[PDB]
Amino acid sequence: MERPKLGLIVREPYASLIVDGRKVWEIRRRKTRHRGPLGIVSGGRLIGQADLVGVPLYAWVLENAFRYEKPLHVPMFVDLSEVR
């Protein structure tokens, strides 16, 4: 919880819409079992975060999103939460 250890690359305008609390469903072609803080990375910057609370397209559900006062810079892991 709190700060995220992992971030998701999201292109604008979506990234912004997410961290400003305007977009609550991020669409993806795969599910994921990640839960909790999820950093939002766009244009090589960590601009904020959201809480991934639940989940041919899928809708990742975000809650409590907010934009950091100042965009953190960056500097990948393969999500294995859906492995069988």
Side-chain angles (χ1 to χ4, degrees):
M1 205 165 249
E2 193 18 39
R3 252 47 176 180
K5 306 301 282 53
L6 310 159
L8 179 68
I9 296 77
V10 187
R11 342 244 61 275
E12 292 292 1
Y14 313 109
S16 286
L17 296 174
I18 285 166
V19 302
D20 295 320
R22 300 184 62 185
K23 171 175 179 52
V24 302
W25 274 26
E26 164 68 356
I27 304 300
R28 292 288 154 143
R29 307 164 72 60
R30 312 278 318 178
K31 285 189 313 194
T32 174
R33 216 165 313 198
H34 170 73
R35 285 303 175 311
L38 181 75
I40 302 299
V41 180
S42 190
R45 286 133 193 307
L46 188 57
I47 63 4
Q49 71 181 66
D51 286 330
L52 189 56
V53 298
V55 186
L57 312 170
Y58 294 115
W60 296 18
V61 178
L62 311 167
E63 292 202 338
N64 331 161
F66 68 83
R67 168 193 295 277
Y68 305 134
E69 58 171 5
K70 269 177 164 290
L72 305 189
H73 220 327
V74 180
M76 306 297 306
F77 287 133
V78 175
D79 177 18
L80 307 172
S81 59
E82 292 313 334
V83 176
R84 329 183 79 258

Coordinates of all heavy atoms in Angstrom, one line a residue:
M1 N 0.9 -1.2 0.0 CA 0.0 0.0 0.0 C 0.9 1.2 0.0 O 2.1 1.1 0.0 CB -0.9 0.0 1.2 CG -2.2 0.8 1.1 SD -3.6 0.3 2.5 CE -4.9 -0.6 1.5
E2 N 0.3 2.4 0.0 CA 1.1 3.6 0.0 C 1.7 3.9 -1.3 O 1.1 4.0 -2.3 CB 2.1 3.7 1.1 CG 2.7 5.1 1.3 CD 1.7 6.1 0.6 OE1 0.5 6.0 0.8 OE2 2.2 7.1 0.0
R3 N 3.1 4.1 -1.4 CA 3.8 4.3 -2.6 C 3.8 3.0 -3.4 O 3.9 1.9 -2.9 CB 5.2 4.8 -2.4 CG 5.4 6.3 -2.7 CD 4.2 7.1 -2.1 NE 4.4 8.5 -2.4 CZ 3.6 9.5 -2.0 NH1 2.4 9.2 -1.3 NH2 3.8 10.8 -2.2
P4 N 3.8 3.1 -4.8 CA 3.9 1.9 -5.6 C 5.3 1.5 -5.8 O 6.2 2.4 -5.9 CB 3.2 2.3 -6.9 CG 3.7 3.7 -7.0 CD 3.6 4.3 -5.6
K5 N 5.5 0.2 -6.0 CA 6.9 -0.3 -6.3 C 6.9 -0.5 -7.8 O 7.9 -0.7 -8.4 CB 7.1 -1.6 -5.5 CG 6.9 -1.5 -4.0 CD 7.8 -0.4 -3.4 CE 9.3 -0.9 -3.2 NZ 9.8 -1.4 -4.5
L6 N 5.7 -0.6 -8.4 CA 5.5 -0.9 -9.8 C 4.7 0.2 -10.5 O 3.7 0.7 -10.0 CB 4.9 -2.2 -10.0 CG 5.5 -3.4 -9.2 CD1 4.6 -4.5 -9.1 CD2 6.8 -3.8 -9.9
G7 N 5.1 0.5 -11.7 CA 4.3 1.5 -12.5 C 3.9 1.0 -13.9 O 4.5 0.1 -14.4
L8 N 2.8 1.5 -14.4 CA 2.3 1.2 -15.6 C 2.4 2.3 -16.6 O 2.0 3.4 -16.4 CB 0.8 0.9 -15.5 CG 0.1 0.5 -16.8 CD1 0.6 -0.9 -17.3 CD2 -1.5 0.5 -16.6
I9 N 3.0 2.0 -17.8 CA 3.1 3.1 -18.8 C 1.7 3.3 -19.4 O 1.0 2.4 -19.8 CB 4.1 2.7 -19.9 CG1 5.5 2.5 -19.3 CG2 4.1 3.7 -21.0 CD1 5.7 1.2 -18.5
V10 N 1.3 4.6 -19.5 CA 0.0 5.0 -20.0 C 0.2 6.2 -20.8 O 0.8 7.2 -20.4 CB -1.0 5.3 -18.9 CG1 -2.3 5.5 -19.4 CG2 -1.0 4.2 -17.8
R11 N -0.3 6.2 -22.0 CA -0.1 7.3 -22.9 C -1.2 8.4 -22.6 O -2.2 8.1 -22.0 CB -0.3 6.9 -24.4 CG -0.2 5.4 -24.6 CD 1.0 5.0 -25.4 NE 2.3 5.5 -24.9 CZ 2.8 6.7 -25.1 NH1 2.1 7.6 -25.8 NH2 4.0 7.0 -24.6
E12 N -0.8 9.7 -22.9 CA -1.8 10.8 -22.7 C -2.8 10.6 -23.8 O -2.5 10.0 -24.9 CB -1.0 12.1 -22.8 CG 0.0 12.3 -21.6 CD -0.7 12.5 -20.3 OE1 -2.0 12.4 -20.3 OE2 0.0 12.7 -19.3
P13 N -4.0 11.2 -23.6 CA -4.5 11.9 -22.4 C -4.9 11.0 -21.2 O -5.1 11.5 -20.1 CB -5.7 12.6 -23.0 CG -6.3 11.6 -23.9 CD -5.1 11.1 -24.6
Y14 N -5.0 9.7 -21.4 CA -5.3 8.7 -20.4 C -4.5 8.8 -19.1 O -5.2 8.9 -18.0 CB -5.2 7.3 -21.0 CG -5.9 7.3 -22.3 CD1 -5.2 7.2 -23.5 CD2 -7.3 7.6 -22.4 CE1 -5.8 7.4 -24.8 CE2 -7.9 7.7 -23.6 CZ -7.2 7.6 -24.8 OH -7.8 7.8 -26.0
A15 N -3.2 8.8 -19.2 CA -2.4 8.9 -18.0 C -2.9 10.1 -17.1 O -3.3 9.9 -15.9 CB -0.9 9.2 -18.4
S16 N -3.0 11.3 -17.7 CA -3.4 12.5 -17.0 C -4.9 12.3 -16.4 O -5.1 12.5 -15.3 CB -3.4 13.7 -17.9 OG -2.1 14.1 -18.1
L17 N -5.8 11.8 -17.3 CA -7.1 11.6 -16.9 C -7.2 10.6 -15.7 O -8.0 10.7 -14.8 CB -8.0 11.0 -18.0 CG -8.2 11.8 -19.3 CD1 -8.9 10.9 -20.3 CD2 -9.1 13.0 -19.0
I18 N -6.3 9.6 -15.7 CA -6.2 8.7 -14.6 C -5.8 9.4 -13.3 O -6.6 9.4 -12.3 CB -5.3 7.5 -14.8 CG1 -6.0 6.6 -15.8 CG2 -5.0 6.8 -13.5 CD1 -5.0 5.5 -16.4
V19 N -4.6 10.0 -13.2 CA -4.1 10.6 -12.0 C -4.9 11.9 -11.6 O -4.7 12.4 -10.5 CB -2.6 11.0 -12.2 CG1 -1.8 9.8 -12.5 CG2 -2.4 12.1 -13.3
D20 N -5.8 12.4 -12.4 CA -6.6 13.5 -12.0 C -7.9 13.0 -11.5 O -8.8 13.8 -11.2 CB -6.7 14.6 -13.2 CG -5.4 15.2 -13.6 OD1 -4.6 15.5 -12.7 OD2 -5.2 15.4 -14.8
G21 N -8.1 11.7 -11.5 CA -9.3 11.1 -11.0 C -10.5 11.1 -12.0 O -11.6 10.8 -11.6
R22 N -10.2 11.4 -13.3 CA -11.3 11.4 -14.2 C -11.6 10.1 -14.9 O -12.7 9.9 -15.5 CB -11.0 12.5 -15.3 CG -10.8 13.9 -14.7 CD -10.6 15.0 -15.7 NE -11.7 15.1 -16.6 CZ -11.8 15.9 -17.7 NH1 -10.8 16.6 -18.0 NH2 -12.9 15.8 -18.4
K23 N -10.6 9.2 -14.9 CA -10.7 7.9 -15.5 C -10.5 6.8 -14.5 O -9.4 6.7 -13.9 CB -9.6 7.9 -16.6 CG -9.4 6.5 -17.3 CD -8.4 6.7 -18.5 CE -8.1 5.4 -19.2 NZ -9.4 4.7 -19.6
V24 N -11.5 6.0 -14.3 CA -11.4 4.9 -13.3 C -11.3 3.5 -13.9 O -11.1 2.5 -13.1 CB -12.7 4.9 -12.4 CG1 -12.8 6.3 -11.7 CG2 -13.9 4.6 -13.2
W25 N -11.4 3.3 -15.2 CA -11.3 2.0 -15.9 C -10.2 2.1 -17.0 O -10.4 2.7 -18.0 CB -12.6 1.6 -16.5 CG -13.5 0.9 -15.6 CD1 -13.6 1.0 -14.2 CD2 -14.6 0.0 -15.9 NE1 -14.6 0.3 -13.7 CE2 -15.3 -0.4 -14.8 CE3 -15.1 -0.5 -17.2 CZ2 -16.4 -1.2 -14.8 CZ3 -16.2 -1.3 -17.2 CH2 -16.8 -1.7 -16.0
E26 N -9.0 1.5 -16.7 CA -8.0 1.5 -17.7 C -8.2 0.2 -18.5 O -8.3 -0.9 -17.9 CB -6.6 1.4 -17.0 CG -5.5 1.0 -18.0 CD -5.2 2.0 -19.1 OE1 -5.9 3.1 -19.2 OE2 -4.2 1.8 -19.8
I27 N -8.3 0.3 -19.8 CA -8.6 -0.8 -20.7 C -7.3 -1.5 -21.1 O -6.4 -0.9 -21.5 CB -9.4 -0.5 -21.9 CG1 -10.7 0.3 -21.6 CG2 -9.7 -1.7 -22.8 CD1 -11.7 -0.5 -20.7
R28 N -7.3 -2.9 -21.0 CA -6.2 -3.7 -21.3 C -6.6 -5.0 -22.0 O -7.7 -5.5 -21.8 CB -5.3 -4.0 -20.1 CG -4.7 -2.7 -19.5 CD -3.5 -2.3 -20.3 NE -3.2 -0.9 -20.2 CZ -1.9 -0.4 -20.2 NH1 -0.9 -1.2 -20.4 NH2 -1.7 1.0 -20.1
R29 N -5.7 -5.6 -22.8 CA -6.1 -6.9 -23.4 C -5.8 -8.1 -22.5 O -6.1 -9.2 -22.9 CB -5.3 -7.0 -24.7 CG -5.4 -5.8 -25.6 CD -4.4 -5.8 -26.7 NE -4.5 -6.8 -27.8 CZ -5.6 -6.9 -28.6 NH1 -6.6 -6.0 -28.4 NH2 -5.7 -7.8 -29.5
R30 N -5.2 -7.9 -21.4 CA -5.0 -9.0 -20.4 C -5.4 -8.6 -19.0 O -5.4 -7.4 -18.7 CB -3.4 -9.3 -20.4 CG -2.7 -9.4 -21.7 CD -2.9 -10.8 -22.3 NE -2.8 -11.9 -21.3 CZ -2.9 -13.2 -21.5 NH1 -3.2 -13.6 -22.8 NH2 -2.8 -14.0 -20.5
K31 N -5.7 -9.6 -18.2 CA -6.0 -9.3 -16.8 C -4.7 -9.3 -16.1 O -3.6 -9.4 -16.7 CB -6.9 -10.4 -16.2 CG -8.3 -10.4 -16.6 CD -9.2 -11.3 -15.8 CE -8.5 -12.7 -15.6 NZ -9.5 -13.7 -15.1
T32 N -4.7 -9.1 -14.8 CA -3.5 -9.0 -14.0 C -4.1 -9.2 -12.6 O -5.2 -8.9 -12.3 CB -2.8 -7.7 -14.1 OG1 -1.7 -7.7 -13.1 CG2 -3.8 -6.6 -13.7
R33 N -3.2 -9.8 -11.7 CA -3.7 -10.0 -10.3 C -3.0 -9.1 -9.4 O -3.0 -9.3 -8.2 CB -3.4 -11.5 -9.9 CG -4.5 -12.1 -9.0 CD -4.4 -13.6 -8.9 NE -4.2 -14.3 -10.3 CZ -4.5 -15.6 -10.5 NH1 -4.9 -16.3 -9.5 NH2 -4.3 -16.1 -11.7
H34 N -2.4 -8.0 -10.0 CA -1.8 -7.0 -9.1 C -2.9 -6.2 -8.4 O -3.9 -5.8 -9.0 CB -1.0 -6.0 -10.0 CG -0.5 -4.8 -9.2 ND1 0.5 -4.8 -8.3 CD2 -1.0 -3.5 -9.2 CE1 0.7 -3.7 -7.8 NE2 -0.2 -2.8 -8.3
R35 N -2.6 -5.9 -7.1 CA -3.6 -5.2 -6.3 C -2.9 -4.2 -5.4 O -1.8 -4.4 -4.9 CB -4.4 -6.1 -5.4 CG -5.4 -6.9 -6.1 CD -6.4 -6.0 -6.8 NE -7.4 -6.7 -7.6 CZ -7.1 -7.7 -8.5 NH1 -5.9 -8.0 -8.7 NH2 -8.1 -8.2 -9.2
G36 N -3.4 -3.0 -5.3 CA -2.8 -1.9 -4.5 C -2.2 -0.8 -5.4 O -2.4 -0.7 -6.6
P37 N -1.3 0.0 -4.7 CA -0.6 1.1 -5.4 C 0.0 0.8 -6.8 O 0.7 -0.2 -6.9 CB 0.4 1.5 -4.4 CG -0.3 1.2 -3.1 CD -0.9 -0.1 -3.3
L38 N -0.4 1.6 -7.8 CA 0.1 1.4 -9.1 C 0.6 2.8 -9.7 O -0.3 3.6 -10.0 CB -1.0 0.8 -10.0 CG -0.5 0.6 -11.5 CD1 0.4 -0.7 -11.5 CD2 -1.7 0.4 -12.4
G39 N 1.9 3.0 -9.8 CA 2.3 4.2 -10.4 C 1.9 4.4 -11.8 O 1.8 3.4 -12.5
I40 N 1.7 5.6 -12.2 CA 1.3 5.9 -13.6 C 2.4 6.6 -14.3 O 2.8 7.7 -14.0 CB 0.1 6.9 -13.6 CG1 -1.1 6.3 -12.8 CG2 -0.3 7.2 -15.0 CD1 -1.7 5.0 -13.3
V41 N 3.1 5.9 -15.2 CA 4.2 6.5 -16.0 C 3.9 6.8 -17.4 O 3.4 6.0 -18.2 CB 5.4 5.5 -15.9 CG1 6.6 6.0 -16.7 CG2 5.8 5.1 -14.5
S42 N 4.1 8.1 -17.8 CA 3.9 8.6 -19.1 C 5.0 9.6 -19.5 O 5.4 10.4 -18.7 CB 2.5 9.3 -19.2 OG 2.1 9.6 -20.5
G43 N 5.4 9.5 -20.8 CA 6.4 10.3 -21.3 C 7.7 10.3 -20.4 O 8.3 11.3 -20.1
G44 N 8.0 9.1 -20.0 CA 9.2 8.9 -19.1 C 9.1 9.6 -17.7 O 10.2 9.8 -17.2
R45 N 7.9 9.8 -17.2 CA 7.8 10.5 -15.9 C 6.7 9.8 -15.1 O 5.7 9.4 -15.6 CB 7.5 12.0 -16.1 CG 8.6 12.8 -16.5 CD 8.3 13.8 -17.6 NE 9.5 14.3 -18.2 CZ 10.4 15.0 -17.5 NH1 10.3 15.1 -16.2 NH2 11.5 15.5 -18.1
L46 N 7.0 9.7 -13.8 CA 6.0 9.1 -12.8 C 5.2 10.3 -12.4 O 5.7 11.2 -11.6 CB 6.8 8.5 -11.7 CG 6.0 7.7 -10.7 CD1 5.3 6.6 -11.4 CD2 6.9 7.1 -9.6
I47 N 4.0 10.5 -12.9 CA 3.2 11.6 -12.6 C 2.2 11.5 -11.4 O 1.7 12.5 -10.9 CB 2.4 12.1 -13.8 CG1 1.4 11.0 -14.3 CG2 3.4 12.5 -14.9 CD1 1.2 9.8 -13.5
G48 N 2.0 10.2 -11.0 CA 1.1 10.0 -9.9 C 0.8 8.5 -9.7 O 1.7 7.7 -10.1
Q49 N -0.3 8.2 -9.1 CA -0.6 6.8 -8.8 C -2.1 6.5 -8.6 O -2.9 7.5 -8.5 CB 0.1 6.3 -7.6 CG -0.4 6.9 -6.3 CD 0.3 6.5 -5.1 OE1 1.5 6.8 -4.9 NE2 -0.3 5.7 -4.2
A50 N -2.4 5.3 -8.6 CA -3.8 4.9 -8.4 C -3.8 3.5 -7.7 O -2.7 2.9 -7.7 CB -4.5 4.7 -9.8
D51 N -4.9 3.1 -7.2 CA -5.0 1.8 -6.5 C -5.7 0.9 -7.4 O -6.9 1.1 -7.8 CB -5.6 2.0 -5.2 CG -4.7 2.6 -4.1 OD1 -3.5 2.5 -4.3 OD2 -5.2 3.3 -3.2
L52 N -5.0 -0.2 -7.8 CA -5.6 -1.2 -8.6 C -6.4 -2.1 -7.6 O -5.8 -2.8 -6.9 CB -4.5 -2.0 -9.3 CG -5.0 -3.0 -10.4 CD1 -5.8 -2.2 -11.4 CD2 -3.8 -3.7 -11.1
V53 N -7.7 -1.9 -7.6 CA -8.5 -2.7 -6.7 C -9.2 -4.0 -7.2 O -9.5 -4.8 -6.4 CB -9.6 -1.8 -6.0 CG1 -8.9 -0.7 -5.3 CG2 -10.5 -1.2 -7.1
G54 N -9.5 -4.0 -8.5 CA -10.1 -5.2 -9.0 C -10.0 -5.2 -10.5 O -9.5 -4.2 -11.1
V55 N -10.4 -6.2 -11.2 CA -10.3 -6.2 -12.7 C -11.6 -6.8 -13.3 O -12.4 -6.1 -13.9 CB -9.1 -7.1 -13.2 CG1 -9.0 -7.0 -14.7 CG2 -7.8 -6.7 -12.5
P56 N -12.0 -8.0 -27.8 CA -11.4 -8.8 -26.6 C -10.7 -7.8 -25.7 O -9.5 -7.7 -25.9 CB -10.5 -9.8 -27.2 CG -10.0 -9.1 -28.4 CD -11.2 -8.3 -29.0
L57 N -11.3 -7.2 -24.7 CA -10.7 -6.3 -23.8 C -11.1 -6.5 -22.3 O -12.1 -7.0 -22.0 CB -11.1 -4.8 -24.2 CG -10.9 -4.5 -25.7 CD1 -11.6 -3.1 -25.9 CD2 -9.5 -4.5 -26.1
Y58 N -10.2 -6.0 -21.4 CA -10.5 -6.0 -20.0 C -10.4 -4.6 -19.4 O -9.7 -3.8 -19.9 CB -9.4 -6.9 -19.3 CG -9.5 -8.4 -19.7 CD1 -8.4 -9.0 -20.4 CD2 -10.6 -9.2 -19.3 CE1 -8.4 -10.4 -20.6 CE2 -10.6 -10.6 -19.6 CZ -9.5 -11.1 -20.2 OH -9.5 -12.5 -20.5
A59 N -11.1 -4.4 -18.2 CA -11.0 -3.1 -17.6 C -10.4 -3.1 -16.2 O -11.1 -3.6 -15.2 CB -12.5 -2.5 -17.5
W60 N -9.2 -2.6 -16.0 CA -8.6 -2.5 -14.7 C -9.2 -1.4 -14.0 O -9.3 -0.3 -14.5 CB -7.1 -2.3 -14.9 CG -6.3 -3.3 -15.6 CD1 -6.8 -4.3 -16.4 CD2 -4.9 -3.5 -15.7 NE1 -5.8 -5.1 -16.9 CE2 -4.6 -4.6 -16.5 CE3 -3.8 -2.8 -15.1 CZ2 -3.3 -5.0 -16.7 CZ3 -2.5 -3.2 -15.3 CH2 -2.3 -4.4 -16.2
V61 N -9.7 -1.7 -12.8 CA -10.4 -0.7 -11.9 C -9.5 0.1 -11.0 O -8.9 -0.5 -10.1 CB -11.5 -1.4 -11.1 CG1 -12.2 -0.4 -10.2 CG2 -12.5 -2.1 -12.1
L62 N -9.5 1.4 -11.1 CA -8.6 2.2 -10.3 C -9.4 3.1 -9.3 O -10.4 3.6 -9.6 CB -7.8 3.1 -11.2 CG -7.1 2.3 -12.3 CD1 -6.5 3.2 -13.4 CD2 -6.0 1.4 -11.7
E63 N -8.8 3.2 -8.1 CA -9.4 4.0 -7.0 C -8.4 4.9 -6.4 O -7.2 4.6 -6.5 CB -10.0 3.1 -5.9 CG -11.2 2.3 -6.3 CD -12.0 1.9 -5.1 OE1 -11.5 1.9 -4.0 OE2 -13.2 1.5 -5.3
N64 N -8.8 6.0 -5.7 CA -7.9 6.8 -5.0 C -6.8 7.4 -5.9 O -5.7 7.5 -5.4 CB -7.3 6.1 -3.8 CG -8.2 5.0 -3.3 OD1 -7.8 4.1 -2.5 ND2 -9.5 5.1 -3.6
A65 N -7.0 7.7 -7.1 CA -5.9 8.3 -7.9 C -5.6 9.7 -7.6 O -6.4 10.5 -7.2 CB -6.2 8.2 -9.4
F66 N -4.3 10.1 -7.7 CA -3.8 11.4 -7.5 C -2.5 11.7 -8.2 O -1.8 10.8 -8.5 CB -3.7 11.7 -6.0 CG -2.6 11.0 -5.3 CD1 -1.3 11.4 -5.4 CD2 -2.8 9.8 -4.5 CE1 -0.2 10.8 -4.7 CE2 -1.8 9.2 -3.8 CZ -0.5 9.7 -3.9
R67 N -2.3 12.9 -8.6 CA -1.1 13.4 -9.3 C -0.1 13.9 -8.3 O -0.5 14.7 -7.5 CB -1.5 14.4 -10.3 CG -0.4 15.2 -10.9 CD -0.9 16.4 -11.6 NE -1.7 16.1 -12.8 CZ -1.3 15.8 -14.0 NH1 0.0 15.8 -14.2 NH2 -2.1 15.4 -15.0
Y68 N 1.1 13.5 -8.4 CA 2.1 14.0 -7.5 C 2.4 15.5 -7.8 O 2.3 15.9 -9.0 CB 3.5 13.3 -7.6 CG 3.3 11.8 -7.4 CD1 4.0 10.9 -8.3 CD2 2.6 11.2 -6.3 CE1 3.9 9.5 -8.1 CE2 2.5 9.9 -6.1 CZ 3.2 9.0 -7.0 OH 3.1 7.6 -6.8
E69 N 2.6 16.3 -6.8 CA 2.9 17.8 -7.0 C 3.9 18.0 -8.0 O 3.9 19.0 -8.8 CB 3.3 18.4 -5.7 CG 4.5 17.7 -5.1 CD 5.1 18.3 -3.9 OE1 4.5 19.3 -3.4 OE2 6.2 17.9 -3.5
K70 N 4.9 17.1 -8.1 CA 6.0 17.2 -9.0 C 6.3 15.9 -9.6 O 6.4 14.9 -8.9 CB 7.3 17.7 -8.3 CG 7.5 19.2 -8.3 CD 8.7 19.6 -7.5 CE 9.2 21.0 -7.7 NZ 9.8 21.1 -9.1
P71 N 6.4 15.8 -11.0 CA 6.6 14.5 -11.7 C 8.0 13.9 -11.4 O 9.0 14.5 -11.7 CB 6.4 14.9 -13.1 CG 6.8 16.3 -13.2 CD 6.2 16.9 -11.9
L72 N 8.0 12.7 -10.9 CA 9.2 12.0 -10.6 C 9.8 11.4 -11.9 O 9.1 11.0 -12.8 CB 9.0 10.9 -9.6 CG 8.3 11.4 -8.3 CD1 8.3 10.3 -7.3 CD2 9.1 12.6 -7.7
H73 N 11.1 11.4 -12.0 CA 11.7 10.9 -13.3 C 12.0 9.4 -13.2 O 12.1 8.8 -12.1 CB 12.9 11.7 -13.7 CG 12.9 11.9 -15.2 ND1 12.4 11.0 -16.1 CD2 13.4 12.9 -15.9 CE1 12.6 11.4 -17.3 NE2 13.2 12.6 -17.2
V74 N 12.2 8.8 -14.4 CA 12.5 7.4 -14.6 C 13.6 7.2 -15.6 O 13.6 8.0 -16.6 CB 11.2 6.6 -15.0 CG1 11.5 5.1 -15.2 CG2 10.1 6.9 -14.0
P75 N 14.5 6.2 -15.5 CA 14.7 5.2 -14.4 C 15.0 5.8 -13.1 O 14.2 5.9 -12.2 CB 15.8 4.4 -15.0 CG 15.6 4.4 -16.4 CD 15.3 5.9 -16.6
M76 N 12.4 -3.2 -16.3 CA 11.0 -3.6 -16.5 C 10.8 -5.0 -16.0 O 11.7 -5.9 -16.1 CB 10.6 -3.6 -18.0 CG 10.8 -2.4 -18.8 SD 9.8 -0.9 -18.1 CE 8.0 -1.7 -18.2
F77 N 9.7 -5.3 -15.4 CA 9.4 -6.7 -14.9 C 8.2 -7.2 -15.6 O 7.3 -6.5 -16.0 CB 9.1 -6.6 -13.4 CG 10.3 -6.4 -12.5 CD1 10.3 -5.4 -11.5 CD2 11.5 -7.1 -12.7 CE1 11.4 -5.2 -10.7 CE2 12.6 -6.9 -11.9 CZ 12.5 -5.9 -10.9
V78 N 8.2 -8.6 -15.8 CA 7.2 -9.3 -16.5 C 6.1 -9.7 -15.5 O 6.4 -10.4 -14.5 CB 7.7 -10.6 -17.2 CG1 6.5 -11.3 -17.8 CG2 8.7 -10.2 -18.3
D79 N 4.9 -9.2 -15.7 CA 3.8 -9.6 -14.7 C 3.5 -11.1 -14.9 O 3.1 -11.6 -15.9 CB 2.5 -8.7 -15.1 CG 1.3 -9.1 -14.3 OD1 1.5 -9.7 -13.2 OD2 0.2 -8.7 -14.7
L80 N 3.7 -11.8 -13.8 CA 3.5 -13.2 -13.8 C 2.2 -13.6 -13.0 O 2.0 -14.7 -12.8 CB 4.7 -14.0 -13.3 CG 6.0 -13.6 -13.9 CD1 7.2 -14.3 -13.2 CD2 6.0 -14.0 -15.4
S81 N 1.5 -12.6 -12.6 CA 0.3 -12.8 -11.7 C -0.8 -13.7 -12.4 O -1.6 -14.3 -11.8 CB -0.3 -11.5 -11.3 OG -0.7 -10.7 -12.3
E82 N -0.7 -13.7 -13.8 CA -1.7 -14.5 -14.5 C -1.1 -15.8 -15.0 O -1.7 -16.5 -15.8 CB -2.2 -13.7 -15.7 CG -3.1 -12.5 -15.4 CD -4.2 -12.8 -14.3 OE1 -4.6 -14.0 -14.2 OE2 -4.6 -11.9 -13.6
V83 N 0.1 -16.2 -14.6 CA 0.7 -17.5 -15.0 C 0.0 -18.6 -14.3 O -0.5 -18.6 -13.2 CB 2.2 -17.5 -14.6 CG1 2.8 -18.9 -14.9 CG2 3.0 -16.4 -15.2
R84 N -0.1 -19.8 -15.1 CA -0.8 -20.9 -14.6 C 0.2 -22.0 -14.1 O 0.2 -22.3 -12.9 CB -1.6 -21.5 -15.7 CG -2.2 -20.4 -16.6 CD -3.1 -20.9 -17.7 NE -4.4 -21.2 -17.2 CZ -4.9 -22.4 -16.9 NH1 -4.2 -23.5 -17.1 NH2 -6.1 -22.5 -16.4

